[PDB]
Amino acid sequence: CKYDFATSVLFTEAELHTRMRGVAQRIADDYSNCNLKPLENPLVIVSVLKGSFVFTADMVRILGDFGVPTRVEFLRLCDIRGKHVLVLEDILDTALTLREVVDSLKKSEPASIKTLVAIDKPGGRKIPFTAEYVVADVPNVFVVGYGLDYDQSYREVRDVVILKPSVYETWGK
Amino acid sequence: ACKYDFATSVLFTEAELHTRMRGVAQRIADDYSNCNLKPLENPLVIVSVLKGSFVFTADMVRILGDFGVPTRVEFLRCDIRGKHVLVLEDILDTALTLREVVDSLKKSEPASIKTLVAIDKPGGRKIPFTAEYVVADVPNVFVVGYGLDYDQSYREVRDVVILKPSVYETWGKELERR
Ligand SMILES: Nc1nc2c(ncn2[C@@H]2C[C@@H](COCCP(=O)(O)O)N(C(=O)CCP(=O)(O)O)C2)c(=O)[nH]1
Numbered sequence: 001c002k003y004d005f006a007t008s009v010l011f012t013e014a015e016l017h018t019r020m021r022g023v024a025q026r027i028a029d030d031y032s033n034c035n036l037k038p039l040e041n042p043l044v045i046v047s048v049l050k051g052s053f054v055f056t057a058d059m060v061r062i063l064g065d066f067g068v069p070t071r072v073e074f075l076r077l078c079d080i081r082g083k084h085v086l087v088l089e090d091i092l093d094t095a096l097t098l099r100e101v102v103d104s105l106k107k108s109e110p111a112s113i114k115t116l117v118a119i120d121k122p123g124g125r126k127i128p129f130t131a132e133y134v135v136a137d138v139p140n141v142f143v144v145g146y147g148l149d150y151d152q153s154y155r156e157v158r159d160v161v162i163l164k165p166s167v168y169e170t171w172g173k
Numbered sequence: 174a175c176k177y178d179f180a181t182s183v184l185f186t187e188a189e190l191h192t193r194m195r196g197v198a199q200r201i202a203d204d205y206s207n208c209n210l211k212p213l214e215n216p217l218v219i220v221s222v223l224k225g226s227f228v229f230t231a232d233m234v235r236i237l238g239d240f241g242v243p244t245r246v247e248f249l250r251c252d253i254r255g256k257h258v259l260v261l262e263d264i265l266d267t268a269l270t271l272r273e274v275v276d277s278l279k280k281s282e283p284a285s286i287k288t289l290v291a292i293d294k295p296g297g298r299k300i301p302f303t304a305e306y307v308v309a310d311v312p313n314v315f316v317v318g319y320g321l322d323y324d325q326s327y328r329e330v331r332d333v334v335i336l337k338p339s340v341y342e343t344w345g346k347e348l349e350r351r
């Protein structure tokens with residue numbers, strides 16, 4: 001590991017962007033008949049969690065690459081009724097946050113609504129929940145990077161790494 | 174001959190923005206070299222102001238990390254006493270927002286405080302204000318991209334472009350509903 005605060009690099013910046021391009025192609029095809037256009041009818045991007053800003057910034061730019069115009073909202077509301085909504089989240093774990101955000105947004109009745117997460121932790125669920133688009137899976141380990149923090153730190157790490165246990169063991173004390 | 178059907182001209186590409194952000198990142202490293210910036214213990218507190226500033230913030234913190242500047246980010250659209258604060262903003266124009274934030278933040282008595290803007294309109298000031306770091310200047314022209322929006326749209330354009338007048342001449346008359 002090139003990082004002195006990590007035991008392993010799980011996904012590099014290039015790997016994530018490669019995967020996110022595969023997802024952007026699915027989104028473009030998926031919404032091909034939604035008549036998405038700037039101002040008139042963009043895809044409403046609802047970014048959840050403070051750390052999601054890194055992923056949201058890269059995803060929205062990649063989405064524009066594939067002809068998907070967007071409009072970003074942050075909850076870390078606008079006018080979603082009748083409009084297509086895509087919730088983005090950097091990590092999906094217990095799914096308790098996503099379920100609540102999805103259910104509440106439905107109260108506004110948008111044309112459609114789907115979710116996209118950068119890191120899915122399939123093994124952390126406390127309720128059933130599947131995201132329409134997943135960039136990468138991560139086992140049951142504490143990772144930081146790509147916006148994911150440990151106590152507000154390491155968000156800027158370009159890759160998704162396993163935080164060396166000596167880091168958070170010494171920081172709690 | 175523009176690559177964007179909605180823009181008259183492209184001012185700064187993503188790559189050019191990053192090349193500039195690399196030069197800025199080196200200066201910040203030198204400037205804070207005596208501050209012992211360290212993750213968790215003493216990170217440089219990044220205050221990102223303005224909704225569209227998430228794009229510049231996402232890229233800037235990452236570049237800064239490349240140059241040995243560990244950061245933690247807050248958003249304005251925490252404890253700062255004794256900490257080093259770098260306010261980040263995608264566009265600086267009248268300076269009214271940045272003046273409010275900086276002077277409101279000085280009340281908490283941080284270790285220091287500076288500002289870094291991606292786009293500085295030197296000629297738009299309503300009050301005097303100079304940013305400590307500026308990635309690039311822009312004149313009296315309406316631009317979009319790199320997080321800068323026109324009515325929430327076009328933030329995702331990877332470059333800072335001048336938006337075609339027909340777009341906002343048309344959309345304004347559409348916003349006129351009543
Ligand atoms: N760095 C890092 N964090 C992890 C990891 N596993 C879980 N988490 C966090 C833990 C908690 C707080 O998250 C603040 C995010 P923030 O600071 O940006 O606000 N979470 C949620 O509550 C999401 C519920 P879900 O998404 O399932 O609905 C996700 C990991 O492995 N590494």
Ligand SMILES: Nc1nc2c(ncn2[C@@H]2C[C@@H](COCCP(=O)(O)O)N(C(=O)CCP(=O)(O)O)C2)c(=O)[nH]1
Pocket residue numbers: 223224225226250264265266267268269270271272314315316317318321322323
């Ligand atoms: N896209 C684009 N916007 C421009 C341009 N010139 C000015 N603005 C805006 C105008 C107003 C709205 O700001 C939206 C931020 P948001 O919608 O993301 O929240 N602003 C401020 O008040 C900054 C306070 P200052 O900089 O003086 O301290 C900046 C341009 O050329 N292109």
